[PDB]
């Protein structure tokens, strides 16, 4: 190769247009039917330890 290099400084506008796809999506969260805490779906609740209606794990 022969070492490609930026020809011009990217403008404020242009580097910020690049970043129009960078906003985080908030975590998706359901209430736990036992303890009512907000938790990710399809995970064992980290607050009361329940999943599928039964105790699975110690919190």
């Amino acid at each position: 190769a022969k070492h490609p290099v930026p020809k011009k400084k990217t403008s404020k506008a242009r580097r910020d247009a690049r970043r129009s796809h960078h906003a985080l999506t908030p975590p998706t969260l359901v209430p736990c039917p036992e303890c009512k805490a907000m938790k990710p779906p399809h995970t064992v609740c980290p607050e009361c330890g329940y999943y599928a209606g039964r105790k699975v794990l110690e919190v």
């Binding site: 938790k39 990710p40 399809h42 995970t43 064992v44 609740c45 980290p46 999943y51 699975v56 794990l57």
Partner: protein
Amino acid sequence: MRHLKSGRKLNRHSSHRLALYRNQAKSLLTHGRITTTVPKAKELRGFVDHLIHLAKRGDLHARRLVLRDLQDVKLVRKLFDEIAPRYRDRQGGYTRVLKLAERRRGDGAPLALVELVE
């Protein structure tokens, strides 16, 4: 292309991957429940379900087969005498994988539990 290929690679060559599965099998069959990453957990299910099923047969051929992976005679004894009998009427499905809610701190990896079924 990966069309119709079974088996995770898990970024391990062939002998390391087989050793990974064997060590996880020993750990599961020893403690009943272990925590791993989700992908590893999902692969353990099959590897351990086969060893348990062979323990259900109980013959000498099964034991020597299972010994090829687990290597530990006391562990196989617990598998043939204590573990396998509780699955006598269960047609497969001896292991379950439930996902955990929090990721590791140092690498964000998603964790799951793998346990033997009641």
